[PDB]
Each structure stands twice: as C-alpha cells, then as structure tokens.
Amino acid sequence: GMASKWDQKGMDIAYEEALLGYKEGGVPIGGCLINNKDGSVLGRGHNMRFQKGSATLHGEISTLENCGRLEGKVYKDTTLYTTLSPCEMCTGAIIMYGIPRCVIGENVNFKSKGEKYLQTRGHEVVVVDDERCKKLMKQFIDERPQDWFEDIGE
Template sequence: MNTDPGFIAAVEEAKKGAAEGGVPIGAALVGKDGTILGRGHNMRVQNGSATLHAEMSALENSGRLPASAYEGATMYTTLSPCDMCTGACILYKIKRVVIGENKNFMGGEEYLKSRGKELVVLDDEECKQMMEKFIKEKPELWNEDIGE
C-alpha cells in the first residue's frame, strides 16, 4: 500500500467522486515542501461542467498562487492525465506527475516527458479497479469524459 500523503489524498478524492455518482478520478497538488496545496476530483457530472477534471479541480482548489508555488510541485492523479490536464501541468510548470494507473486510459504522458516533466506510474491496483468498475457500469459517462 502506498503511504505517500499526496497519493492517499488523490485516492480519497477519487472515492469521493464515485460516492457522488461521478467519474472516480482524484488528484492532489503538493508543493515542493510536501504541503498539499489543493485536492479535488472529477466534477463533470456533479457540476454539469465540461472541464472540471480532477487535476483541474485540484488546481482550482489550490486558489490563486504565485507561479513559484507551482514550480517544483507534484501533481498526484489516480489516472493518466488527459490532454487538457497535461497542458495545465505544463502551463503551471509542475515538475512531477505521479499517476496511479494508465491501463484504463493513457493520456499525455509522452508529451509531459517531452516537456521535461518527471513521471512516476504506480500501477496501483485500487485505482485500476475503481476505473474498470466505472467504465463497465457507466460507459456513456466515461466516453463523454474522454471526448468520445
């Protein structure tokens, strides 16, 4: 079991999203000093939002921060980030992205690497199972979430 507080927060957020009937993806933004700056989960279903993915929610919940707060930060996410969330990590100069799993969806990982971001893929069984269950039970919501 992973004991990293940032990853634990992301998984807690994913579970919260699932309990609310949404897409079970969570994220946490952790500063270079280890402080959780913001955390969030996919809120597209709950808020009727086109863009409120977990990583965007974590950034939003971080509040307005100086650029220096993002540099050296780590984004923890339970699923490989989509192109939009990949772009946000690049825009805010987030140094490192820790991914719970990328078997159910492979996002912009190669682009992140090409932009000098450090990637860690945990291949976490709990994250995989949450997404597998959601995709099986709600394929229409999943396809909508990934733009298909």
C-alpha cells in the same frame, strides 16, 4: 522518474478524492497538489463533470482550481498526484504552470499521448500502478461506459 517520500501520501489523498467523487455519483478520478519540500497539501479535488455539469473540471483541473489563485513560482516545486493518466487538457495545465512532477496511479484503463508529452517537455512522470485506483476506474467504465466516453470527448 524516481520515487519521492511524499508519493504514498499524495496518492492516498488522490484515491480518497476519487472515492469521494464516486460516492457523489461522478467519475472516480481524484488528485492533489503537494509541495515537494514540506509535503504540504496546496489543494485536492476530483472530477466534477456530473456534480456541476462541468465539461472542464476533470480531476486534475478541479485540484488546481481548489488550490486557488497562486503566484507562478509556487507551482515550480510541487508534484501533481492523479489517480489516472492525464488527458491532453490536464497535461497542458501541468505544462503551463510549470508543475515539474506528475505521479500517476495507473495508465491501464486510460492513457493519452499526454503522459509521454510531459516527459518530452522536461517534466518527470511516475506511474505507480495502484490497484485500488485501477480497480475503481475499471468498475466505472464497465458500468457507465457512455458517461466515461463523454468525459474524454468520445
């Protein structure tokens, strides 16, 4: 998919969220939801598995949760920014709400069939190959492999 004028802004917010969660002792993966028109931020968040003993609050899920209850149409013209290629669960959330565009920081440390499934389902996908993200996630995996495995049900 083509780039958008809000991509740089969206990925920066996501990385900051991932840095936040990192400081808090959790999995360094952040994200944010933004309106494709005015570039407003509907919400932002990061993985809360460790911060809340959560088995479902991945970075993408936490972000949607932080946006609060919304009318369906609201999701239809937004872009979900995530520092890491979405897992099947997070992919499903994007597809269910109809979020048409997903911008991914990197898919080197992790990638599920979800990235391709989104495209197959009529969703636009962009991989930025952000080195800050890749480097941060790379570190977490090497230093806490078992915690990472658990985050992806392995």
